[PDB]
Amino acid sequence: KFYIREPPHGSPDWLKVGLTLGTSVFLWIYLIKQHKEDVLEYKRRNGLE
Amino acid sequence: MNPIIYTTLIMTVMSGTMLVMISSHWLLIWIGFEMNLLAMIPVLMKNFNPRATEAATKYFLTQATASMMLMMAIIINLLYSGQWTITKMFNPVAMTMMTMALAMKLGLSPFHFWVPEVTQGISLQAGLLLLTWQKLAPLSVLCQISQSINPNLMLTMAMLSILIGGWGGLNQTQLRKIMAYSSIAHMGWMTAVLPYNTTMTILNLLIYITMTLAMFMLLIHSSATTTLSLSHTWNKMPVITSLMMVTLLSMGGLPPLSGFMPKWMIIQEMTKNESIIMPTLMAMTALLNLYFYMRLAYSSSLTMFPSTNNMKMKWQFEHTKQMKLLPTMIVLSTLVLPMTPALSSLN
Amino acid sequence: ARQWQPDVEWAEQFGGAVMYPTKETAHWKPPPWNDVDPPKDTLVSNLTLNFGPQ
Amino acid sequence: MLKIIIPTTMLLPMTWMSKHNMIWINATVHSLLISLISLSLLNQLGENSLNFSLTFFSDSLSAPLLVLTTWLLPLMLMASQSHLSKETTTRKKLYITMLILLQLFLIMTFTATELILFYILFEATLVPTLIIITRWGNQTERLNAGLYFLFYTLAGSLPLLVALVYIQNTTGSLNFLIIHYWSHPLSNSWSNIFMWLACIMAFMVKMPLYGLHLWLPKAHVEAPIAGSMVLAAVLLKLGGYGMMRITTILNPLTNYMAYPFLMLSMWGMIMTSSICLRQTDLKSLIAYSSVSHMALVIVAIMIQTPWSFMGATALMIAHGLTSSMLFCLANTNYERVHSRTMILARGLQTLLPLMATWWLVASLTNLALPPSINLIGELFIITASFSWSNITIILMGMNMMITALYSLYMLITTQRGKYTHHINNIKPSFTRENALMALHILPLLLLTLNPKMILGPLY
Amino acid sequence: MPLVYMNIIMAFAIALAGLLMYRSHLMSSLLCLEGMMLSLFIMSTLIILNTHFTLANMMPIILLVFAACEAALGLSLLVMVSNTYGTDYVQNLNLLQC
Amino acid sequence: IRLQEDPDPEDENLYEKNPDSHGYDKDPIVDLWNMRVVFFFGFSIVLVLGSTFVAYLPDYRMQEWARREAERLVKYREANGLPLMESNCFDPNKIQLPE
Amino acid sequence: LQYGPLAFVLGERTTRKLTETSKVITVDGNICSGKGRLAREIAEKLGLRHFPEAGIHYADSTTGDGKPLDVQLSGNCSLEKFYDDPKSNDGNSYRLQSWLYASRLLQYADALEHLLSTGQGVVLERSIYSDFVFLEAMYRQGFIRKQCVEHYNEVKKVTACEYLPPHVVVYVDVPVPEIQSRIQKKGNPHEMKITAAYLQDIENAYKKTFLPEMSEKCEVLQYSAREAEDAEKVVEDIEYLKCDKGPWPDQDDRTFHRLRMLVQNKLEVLNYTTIPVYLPEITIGAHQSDRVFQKFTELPGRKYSPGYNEDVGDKWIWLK
Amino acid sequence: SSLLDLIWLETILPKTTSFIQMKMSIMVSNQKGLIKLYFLSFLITIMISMTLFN
Ligand SMILES: CCCCCCCCCCCCCCCCCC(=O)OC[C@H](COP(=O)([O-])OCC[N+](C)(C)C)OC(=O)CCCCCCCCCCCCCCCCC
Ligand SMILES: CCCCCCCCCCCCCCCCC[C@@H](O)O[C@H](CO[C@H](O)CCCCCCCCCCCCCCC)COP(=O)(O)OCC[N+](C)(C)C
Ligand SMILES: CCCCCCCC/C=C/CCCCCCCC(=O)OC[C@H](COP(=O)(O)OCCN)OC(=O)CCCCCCC/C=C/CCCCCCCC
Ligand SMILES: Nc1ncnc2c1ncn2[C@@H]1O[C@H](COP(=O)(O)OP(=O)(O)O)[C@@H](O)[C@H]1O
């Protein structure tokens, strides 16, 4: 307890932290899946594999 | 003004601009312009004072005259062609009227005085919105009707805009007037490249909008409207002054910053059309913009001006309100030169 | 023995109404700090009427 | 070239994550390591250049300049750590970051394989230099000096950008190999004359040419020690490197458009040496000496013979090292007495012996004393100019006489005589300063031992 | 082109010249601004009626609507200026300088 | 006076607190180690190792190879009466001049 | 969440929060009066929050830890030095006056924020509108200059033109001889060096300017020492002041919203306290400014934001 | 040093150009902000555009 008045960010905003981490994880998963699907579609269209 | 009224007026301005950008009918385009002006005037007059009232009056008069000329051009084009679709206009007189009306709306020289006058009259947020949105819409119309623009008239107005903006910004000391003259010069550049590559026009518009947003957000953060007011910011938060110095260097077109990309691409495109004197003059004239950017940078960041005594209390307190996307604007306005070939995606 | 930094003279150079003063520009003044000009003493000049006697 | 570029981009996080008292040590050690790594580029071929990839390539002209830059960075670090003791940790890190960015841009400039990328990088070298000058300069004139430097360089360089984009549109490529193998003669016409003017004038302003040089005294005198060291050693050589690279496509128009520039360079070399004879400021004297030497390099490039290019390269390297050493010596004497007047401090020969020895060696190398590489380059240029015409010998002889005169005048005024009676704050020379002088001078003598490493591709 | 269109275009040109040349009053300039849209309305309806553009007959009504919207905006700005300065003179709108 | 400004401080001497100072830093240990790393790395590593590396760089410029090739060509040409230096770089049979 | 436009459209309304007793009461008086005791008693009896006189280091008390900072980092002025040598050549008098005005402005902003966000009334031991009496007394005694007075007037205009006046102004009138007697009995040498004219000038400014000025805005209560010593009658008189001709009845929800948004932003409150007017008294050179700012950043809990100071015991920085 | 380096080489490129830019900047920015004046300028510009450009 150093501040006479409670700082606005004294405690982590757990809702915001969860939203941020979940959004990052979801975006990375979606990007990986999208790249996989794009590679497969390109292979199918150009008759490689 | 009530927050609901303010947000609905902002949404009406954006609705008018979107109507202009999505309409295929000249009457609907004119309706969009009228709605934009009607909802924009109270936004300028939000903070009531004689300066705000005078700025709103001058802006309204200029925009009303431009809209009347635009409607006359539409009617004349209808007379000689019987067409309402926005395409290559079928009458040179109607095209000249339309070009002059849109140039007056954009503030191109010799229709420029209202830009510094209104920008100095209105607050920082109002100036930001004014510059960005009210340059966004008429340039959309001009890009749509580019194939019938008279190159001589368009390039004359563009060169006049560049010269006048450089000289005015050179003389001014007020930050809002400096920003207005910078806007005039950048509008000159964009309209100069317009009759050759609307894609390059859009690229320059995007870069200019990013840089202007970053600069105006920094000015709002520092709460400075003059040069001396900005000269005290180094003693309270030197990070803002350093970021603003980098942004000012970018706005001058210094490599390898983002501001060099529009000038570089415009010079290349205009040279492709066997035009050399115009790109050379446009490149050489920008040194005035760079000079007054550098003069502003000396006062704020590269040197340390005298401070006052209550700055200690200002140190003790903290900046409460946050302007989101400011770091993104600062990054995108300084460090996107290697990503230049994305203009094909913009195409 | 230390790096030179701008002083009051430099600040006053940079803090006029406009750079490069002329006669008219010297006659000009810088804008107010809060953009609010002082109110003008405009006289109301209310209408005066003779209600009566006829 | 990535094995040299990436270590600098890793030097940046090292500088910004090091402890407050270890920044100079870390930066110096790893800069020396990067220089040692960059010494490998000196192994050049006898037929073609070293083409690493589609973006970066190395040549017998690019290699010595890269090695000079990588070797010059730690010396700038030493001088800066000398004169920036009271700065905060963040500002020290910012200064080191500016130096690192300047070195990175210089490396990419000298290794760029395309003219437009070369233009972008050699223009990008202005921003760190301008920040350094206008932020850490001592005098009030640093702002005006920065303005002069920036606007001279940019007014020179913008028509160069227009010319480069026009050449790309006309020919299809700005790649140096393509423009060399597919070069075509330049017909005598106004359009070709103005293209030649755009390119050559940009690089002449960068050189600088006589009549376009005021920014050089302004910037060099008013910049900090590191800025002065980098301005003369490397940043002046961008013009010469560009002119050597760009003159491939400008023939045969160069045979006729070189007369005004040759006359300007020769007569201004004489004039700037004479100016050095009557200078009341030591930094100004060194700056005008730099102007004279770069005017000689301009003469060599304009006459454009295989013997002139070799002399031009050797003179560029030698002048870079000598000018850096002279600026360092002047900065040490300035730190002693806090003034740049040349006659204020005298008797330094009897007040500081080893520093007087360093002064003597630097002055001997400044004038063309054989077998130094300064003399090698100057003699090659003089012989090529003699082949060009037989009065260039008259002009070169006058320049050499005045060069010896002003060099020994500076040495005698600063060192000989009797010490100033009232100046009693001249402490013994520091180990750091003596090591800086030794690291400046020994590579010069080693390059004298092995001269073919700095004679360019024409060797 | 008949002479009626000539006269209507001349009327619009006269109204435009009147707006661009102020004398003292902001109200007179607003009146000139209203005349321009009157001429535009007349020209548009003369063109539409002559060519039997049946669906275009609704355009002049929208033109009038936005004309009087602009008139309302100008009157609001004029009353604010009058409250500020005591007269609607355009000479008092000089606080801002170009 | 027109400001509340600090007076210009007196210049600081490193020898005052540390008589055996190399001039690198105020702290004696950091100063000594800065001197050690600078001297060792710079002089020893860079100077000695880079200079001997440059001295023993392989002959990629083909000076010795060119000398040997010239010796062989001179031997062959002088042993058969041919000119030592040809008068043409290319073959006039392969060059087709315009008429 | 923090108050803002979204909260306003959600429905948080100042008029709804007000409880008809949300009054701003300022107790004023000359040097060494019973105004402090009167303010304490009024705040206690009426249930209002008491804000003592806004002296130096009030901003220190309201930020970081409650402990006041060093004089070099907060105020750079001394009341003791002003008393001992009023006509110093270093601008101490006007530095002190400007810093005290800024402190009073900050305290008034805090009190207004408390009243608007809580509905409870506030009792200030002095306000912005009574601060100028010390400036007039200093100027008429020759302690400061006309340029200093003009700068104070500019700052006061552009700052206090935005805030609402107090509901109640209670002035305790004490004659100068009694003031000097109380000062002599207190025994503090620095204020024992106060001259008679300086005490008289404050009284003249209070009676001739402050009271006539505030009477037009709203009702003003004037009490002598004996009347002020009995606070029951003072509270009874305050309670039966049903008249209110000030702007508070005229205020609406939108105006209150703007006022709350202004007062909750302290940097926006103190925006015009540092305007580029280079008076020698208050101007600080570049080197001194940089050194003092470096020291302030070197302070324990000042380098980063309040939630991000590790050395004072803040955790979870990497997830904050 | 004096006549050429410090006087005339300064007068030709850097000083004359700067003086011209300053004069033109003063000329452009020396406006009283009168809508009558610059709207008359607008009328002149419109007539010039209509006639000169074909
Ligand atoms: C077939 C074999 C052929 C020969 C092969 C040789 C291989 C050598 C392999 C071991 C090398 C590493 C150990 C020795 C390192 C040098 C230490 C030394 O000499 O100190 C004595 C000198 C002198 O020591 P001193 O002066 O401190 O001590 C004197 C003695 N007392 C204690 C009494 C005072 O050390 C210094 O001056 C210290 C300076 C800093 C040293 C930092 C070393 C960092 C680690 C090594 C990095 C090497 C990178 C080289 C560049 C990259 C590769 C080219
Ligand atoms: C205190 C007293 C001082 C004087 C006494 C000192 C002690 C006696 C020293 C006497 C030396 C006198 C000169 C005699 C030198 C003998 C060695 C010399 O001859 O070798 C040269 C060696 O030359 C070296 O290459 C010189 C090294 C050059 C180093 C350049 C700088 C190193 C990096 C520094 C970074 C700075 C960069 C600067 C810009 C590039 C010759 O080259 P080369 O004949 O073929 O070598 C033969 C080996 N081969 C056949 C396999 C090739
Ligand atoms: C491009 C790169 C090519 C490949 C390069 C490979 C080589 C990698 C180079 C590694 C860098 C070498 C270390 C750099 C010098 C470190 C400086 C240093 O030692 O710090 C000083 C140090 C600690 O800081 P203080 O002075 O105490 O400050 C206290 C403040 N209150 O001083 C001391 O007290 C230490 C004394 C005893 C340590 C002796 C260290 C001797 C050096 C050898 C250690 C390295 C091990 C060898 C690894 C070889 C790897 C190939
Ligand atoms: N604006 C100001 N300028 C100068 N001095 C001030 C100012 N405000 C308060 N002071 C000083 O602060 C001190 C506060 O004393 P005060 O609280 O009035 O005593 P008491 O509580 O006995 O009435 C006074 O001596 C006064 O001189």
Q: What is the CATH number of the domain that holds E56?
A: 1.10.287.3510
Q: Report the number of secondary-structure helices (H) and strands (E) in chain A.
A: 1, 0
- Atom 18 in ligand 3: which residue has the minimum CA distance? F33
Domain tally, chain E: 1
Cβ atoms of F60 and D46 within 8 Å: the answer is yes
Interface contact flag, D214 H14, Cβ < 8 Å: yes
Q: Which amino acid is present at B100? A: M
| Token pair recorded at residue D62 | 């690019």
Interface contact flag, H22 C20, Cβ < 8 Å: yes
CA B327 to chain centre: 20
Binding-site annotation, residues of G for Mg(2+): 30, 32, 35, 53, 125
Ligand with the closest atom to the CA of F39: 1
| Token pair recorded at residue B293 | 């950017």
| Count of Cβ atoms closer than 10 Å to residue B20 Cβ | 23
Query: Which of the listed residues D33, D37, D38, D40 should we mutate to test ligand 1's pocket, taking the one with most ligand atoms within 8 A of CB?
Result: D33
In the 8-state DSSP scheme, what is residue D373? Answer: H
- Atom 9 in ligand 4: which residue has the minimum CA distance? G55
Which residues, in sequence order, are CB contacts of D238 under 8 Å at separation 6+? D109, D122, D125, D203, D206
* Cβ-Cβ contacts under 8 Å, H7 against chain D: none
Residue pointed to by tokens 């009496």 = G133
Nearest alpha-carbon partner for D210 in H13, F75, F24: H13
| Token pair recorded at residue G184 | 């002599």
- Atom 2 in ligand 3: which residue has the minimum CA distance? D33
**E33 inside domain:** yes
| Interface with chain E: mutation pick from H35, H40, H44, H51, highest number of E CBs within 10 Å | H35
Q: Specify the pairing of strand G122-124 against strand D50-51.
A: unpaired
Cβ atoms of G163 and G26 within 8 Å: the answer is no
Residue D201, class by beta-carbon neighbours within 10 Å (0-12 exposed, 13-18 middle, 19+ buried)?
buried
CA B129, CA B137: separation in Å to the nearest integer?
Answer: 12
Interface contact flag, B68 E37, Cβ < 8 Å: yes
Residues 381-420, chain D, touching B (beta carbon < 8 A): none
Which residues, in sequence order, are CB contacts of D20 under 8 Å at separation 6+? D89
Q: Mutual orientation of helices D237-246 and D282-303 as an angle, nearest 10°?
A: 10
- Atom 37 in ligand 1: which residue has the minimum CA distance? F36
* Cβ-Cβ contacts under 8 Å, G154 against chain C: 33
* Cβ-Cβ contacts under 8 Å, G309 against chain A: 2
Interface contact flag, F5 G285, Cβ < 8 Å: yes
CA D133, CA G272: separation in Å to the nearest integer?
Answer: 34
CA G314, CA G318: separation in Å to the nearest integer?
Answer: 11
- Cis omega (within 30 of 0) for bond into C53: yes
CA B340, CA B166: separation in Å to the nearest integer?
Answer: 26
Give the residue from chain F lying closest to G291, CA to CA. Answer: F6
Nearest alpha-carbon partner for D444 in D355, D352, D376, D380: D376
**E36 inside domain:** yes
Tell me the C-alpha to C-alpha distance, in Å, between residue D367 and each of A25, D48, D288, D420, G156: 67, 34, 14, 28, 69
State whether residue B46 sits within 8 Å of chain C by CB.
Answer: no
Three-state secondary-structure class, residue G279: coil
CA G319, CA G308: separation in Å to the nearest integer?
Answer: 11
Cβ atoms of G123 and G53 within 8 Å: the answer is no
Chains that touch G (3 or more CB pairs under 8 A): A, B, C, F
Q: CA-CA-CA-CA torsion for B218, B224, B225, B227, nearest 10 degrees?
A: -100
| Interface with chain G: mutation pick from F2, F4, F5, F8, highest number of G CBs within 10 Å | F4
At least 3 CB pairs under 8 A between chains H and A: no
- Cis omega (within 30 of 0) for bond into G165: no
**E26 inside domain:** yes
Query: Which of the listed residues F27, F30, F34, F39 should we mutate to test ligand 3's pocket, taking the one with most ligand atoms within 8 A of CB?
Result: F30
CA B223, CA B102: separation in Å to the nearest integer?
Answer: 33
* Cβ-Cβ contacts under 8 Å, G273 against chain B: 310, 313-314
Query: Which of the listed residues D25, D26, D36 should we mutate to test ligand 1's pocket, taking the one with most ligand atoms within 8 A of CB?
Result: D36
Which residues, in sequence order, are CB contacts of D338 under 8 Å at separation 6+? C1, F11
| Count of Cβ atoms closer than 10 Å to residue F17 Cβ | 10
Ligand 2, CB within 6 Å, residue ranges: D 39, 64, 67-68, 71, 317, 443, 446-447, 449-450; F 46, 50-51, 54-56
Cβ atoms of B323 and B243 within 8 Å: the answer is no
In the 8-state DSSP scheme, what is residue H17? Answer: H
Q: What is the resolution of the experimental data for this entry, in Å?
A: 3.1
Strand partners, G155: none
Interface contact flag, D271 H14, Cβ < 8 Å: no
Question: Min CA distance, D456 vs chain F (Å)?
Answer: 12
Which residues, in sequence order, are CB contacts of D419 under 8 Å at separation 6+? D345, D346, D347, D348, D350, D351
**E21 inside domain:** yes
Q: Which amino acid is present at H47? A: M
Query: Which of A4, A8, A9 is facing G65, going by the closest CB pair?
Result: A4
- Cis omega (within 30 of 0) for bond into D252: yes
**E97 inside domain:** no
- Cis omega (within 30 of 0) for bond into B256: yes
Three-state secondary-structure class, residue B38: helix
CA G265, CA B321: separation in Å to the nearest integer?
Answer: 8
Helix (H) / strand (E) element for D50: namely strand D50-51
Per-residue burial over G52-61, b if 16 or more Cβ lie within 10 Å, else e, is ebbbbbbbbb
Three-state secondary-structure class, residue G24: strand
Interface contact flag, C37 B304, Cβ < 8 Å: no
Backbone angles phi, psi at C42, to 5 degrees: -75, 130
Cβ atoms of D107 and D249 within 8 Å: the answer is no
Interface contact flag, C20 H26, Cβ < 8 Å: yes
Q: Specify the pairing of strand G168-172 against strand D57-58.
A: unpaired
Domain range for E7 is: 3-92
Q: How far apart are the first and last CA of chain A?
A: 64
Three-state secondary-structure class, residue G263: helix
Interface contact flag, E96 H33, Cβ < 8 Å: yes
Residue pointed to by tokens 């435009």 = E16
Interface contact flag, E86 C40, Cβ < 8 Å: yes
Ligand with the closest atom to the CA of G101: 4
Q: Mutual orientation of helices D23-38 and F28-37 as an angle, nearest 10°?
A: 0
In the 8-state DSSP scheme, what is residue G51? Answer: E
CA E65, CA D181: separation in Å to the nearest integer?
Answer: 70
Give G271's Cβ-side CA count (13 Å radius): 21
| Token pair recorded at residue D141 | 């004139």
CA B170, CA B290: separation in Å to the nearest integer?
Answer: 9
**E11 inside domain:** yes
Three-state secondary-structure class, residue D51: strand
Tell me the CA–centroid distance for residue F41 and ligand 1, in Å.
9
Residues 25-54, chain H, touching C (beta carbon < 8 A): 25-26, 29-30, 32
Question: Min CA distance, H4 vs chain D (Å)?
Answer: 9
Residue B82 sits at the vertex; the CA angle it makes with B78 and B88, to the nearest 5 degrees, is 70
Tell me the CA–centroid distance for residue D217 and ligand 3, in Å.
41
Residue B289 sits at the vertex; the CA angle it makes with B287 and B292, to the nearest 5 degrees, is 105
* Cβ-Cβ contacts under 8 Å, A11 against chain G: 316
CA D311, CA D387: separation in Å to the nearest integer?
Answer: 14
| Token pair recorded at residue G175 | 């004659």
Experimental method, per PDB record:
cryo-EM
Interface contact flag, H26 C22, Cβ < 8 Å: yes
* Cβ-Cβ contacts under 8 Å, F4 against chain G: 76, 90-91, 283-285, 288
Interface contact flag, D271 H4, Cβ < 8 Å: yes
CA G312, CA G92: separation in Å to the nearest integer?
Answer: 34
Strand partners, F82: none
**E98 inside domain:** no
State whether residue H5 sits within 8 Å of chain D by CB.
Answer: yes
CA B90, CA B83: separation in Å to the nearest integer?
Answer: 9
Chains that touch B (3 or more CB pairs under 8 A): C, D, E, G, H
Ligand with the closest atom to the CA of D37: 3
Three-state secondary-structure class, residue D372: coil
| Interface B-G: count of C-beta contacts within 8 A | 106
Strands of G168-172's sheet, edge to edge?
G49-51, G122-124, G24-29, G168-172, G220-223
Query: Which of H28, H45, H50 is facing B167, going by the closest CB pair?
Result: H28
Interface contact flag, D138 C1, Cβ < 8 Å: no
Strand partners, D175: D114
Tell me the C-alpha to C-alpha distance, in Å, between residue D276 and each of B252, D268, D280, D404: 36, 12, 9, 11
Per-residue burial over D211-245, b if 16 or more Cβ lie within 10 Å, else e, is bbbbbbbbbbbbbbbbbbbbbbbbbbbbbbbbbbb
